[PDB]
Each structure stands twice: as C-alpha cells, then as structure tokens.
Design brief:
The PDB classes it as viral protein/transferase/rna. This is part of a larger assembly, with one copy of chain A (141 residues) and four copies of chain B. Chain A is mainly alpha-helical. Chain A has three helices and no strands. The longest helix of chain A has 19 residues. The longest helix of chain B has 15 residues. The chains are: A mainly alpha (141), B mainly alpha (50).
Amino acid sequence: MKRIPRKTKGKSPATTEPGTSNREQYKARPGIASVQRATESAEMPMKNNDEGTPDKKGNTKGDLVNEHSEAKDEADEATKKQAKDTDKSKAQVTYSDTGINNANELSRSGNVDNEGGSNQKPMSTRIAEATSAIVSKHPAR
Amino acid sequence: EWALTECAQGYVTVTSPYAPSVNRLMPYRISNAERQISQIIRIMNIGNNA
Amino acid sequence: YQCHVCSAVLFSPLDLDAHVASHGLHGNIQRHITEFISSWQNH
Amino acid sequence: FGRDCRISFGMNGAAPMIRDETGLMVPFEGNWIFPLALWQMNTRYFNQQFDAWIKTGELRIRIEMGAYPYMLHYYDPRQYANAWNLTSAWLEEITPTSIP
Amino acid sequence: IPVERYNILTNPDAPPTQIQLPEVVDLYNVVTRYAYETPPITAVVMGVP
C-alpha cells in the first residue's frame, strides 16, 4: 500500500574487489555543472498562452486591449526580457521595431468572444439581462 | 539502446543490460500522427505572442 | 558495494538490492525516473 | 578489439562475455590486443571489470602504445617481491586525457 | 431478484466470459488482476575511441 499525492487541486570472506578503488583525476571539459545549468533552462516547457479563451463561468479571460496593440505590447515585453537575460541596458536581439512592416499582425486578446462580438459586457451579464427581460410575476392589484 | 545510440550521431554508445521478463511495462511507443497532432497544437498555441 | 550488472558504486546492501531491482533482479528510490552512469568517470 | 567495446553480463553463473572484432563474443580469458584510446575512454568500467581476472585469473592484454615513458624499480633477488601494487596504481590512473 | 444480471451463476450454459452488453449489465463476472513492474530507464554511456 503506497499513497501518491496530487500536484493539482481536483474536483473537491574478503570483499574488497581489486578494481573498485577510486583515483579520480579527470576534469570534464566542458564541465558537468556548466552543461547541466544550460540544459535546465532549455528543459522548461513552453509557457501557456490562455488569453481570449472562455473561463469556467463562460466569460472570456484576458484584457480589453486592441489585438494589434496587444501584439505590440507583447513584442516590447519580449525585447525587454531579452535585454534582461543578457544583462544589458538595451537588447542586441530585438523583437520590436524591426525593418519589417508587420502592421497587420494580430494577437489573441480578451477583447473579442467566440461569436466575434465585443466583450465590453461579459457573456454572463448579457445572458442574465436577456433572460431577465421576459420573466413573469404573480398577479397583483 | 538502439534509439539513444542512433541519436548520438556515433559519438557515444549506450548499453542497458536487463534480465529476461515479460511483465515489465515501459509504455513509450506512439505513432507519428500523434506527434504531428501535438506539434500542430503547440504551433497554434503561439498565436503571434513573442 | 558494487553492482556488477551496471558497474555502479553503492554503499548499502539494501541500496544494492534496490539497484539490482532496477535491473529486473529480484531483491535477495521509487522517486527515480532515469539513471545514467558514464564509463570513463565516476559521476 | 576495436570501436565496438560492449559487454554482456553473465547470468546464473555463466561467465561474462565481450564482443570480438569479428562479431564473436568471448569470455574473460586468453590473449587480447587493445588500442590505448579504447581503454582511455572506458577507464573506470574496464578497471571495474577486468582487474580481478588480470590479478588472479588467466587474462593477458597487450596494449598498443607505440612510444611511452617508463620508470624503473629495482629489487633484491633474494626477497619475495610482488609488482601488483605498482601495476594497479598505473591502471587506475589512466585518464581519457592522461597516462602516468 | 433480477436473475438475468447474475447470468454466469444462474445460467448453467453460459460460458464464463459471456456478457450481455449493451442491454443488461452483469453484476457478477470474471475479472483479471495483474502485477507489473515499471523499472526506471537505465543506461550506461560508453566512449568511442
């Protein structure tokens, strides 16, 4: 009987062998630790990109930003992070302000739902408003 | 053994001895089509997000 | 302690039984997923 | 023996075996011929495997080196003398980039 | 008692592995139980001279 925990919340005689002596004098080149550290970074999985998708309730998560503006902001953040990684004030490799006129680029955002409408008012609010306009009431007066 | 040896481009050789048994379960074999589906998912995940 | 199945270096007899269990031999940590040992160095 | 150094462990008393150059597998016995680099790249494994047979079994190896430095050790003929310590020290210190 | 559920007990002619899906789900039937091993991936890396 072994128990395994969940990592995510759910619904709720002489023996001295004549060759085993250790005389280590070899220094790995490249070093083991140096390669291990680099492999750790590349080992990480790709980050999630969840914006623009419906939630548990039915409301599309994300920000209320124009898609092209969202793409520009994401490019700027990428350049910023790249600069931070190499420990420089300005990045040598830039994802923004390239020579390419990528004006028609679109990025997923929380501005639009799956019907192509605007999320200026969330789904659940719209369903509530629509269903409310027709409810009856007990007779009176 | 074969897969790791082939991957290393003939720079190292890999050996993994084992005793004979049949109730040893190591589920790893899948088809190419499943990997292709997974790659399509991964590509679609990007969505122009630098 | 020495495991001649894979030429690894061990220190406890129960560790030897566990290690040879990884080779399929009956015992005369489960947290491990992969075990690699080089031949030109002890690491 | 060439680039195909690989050993199958013995089971239930059967002796261990290694692959010849000609695709045959032989027990740890007889006369062998090694290029030096073959031992240099598997120092630890080879010391773990062959040393017992070399020390007390019937296994003899010729190492192809070409040229090498040497260092003598004189001894009295009338006294018992064993060279195993020196040879074991030499073997264990083989390195994929150095030899003594 | 719903006899047809307990077929392999009440019907002397039914083979032990017979089922009646999807009309009737038997509440008593043969089950196979295993015990496998999941060894870690073990490897030894040799050098090429």
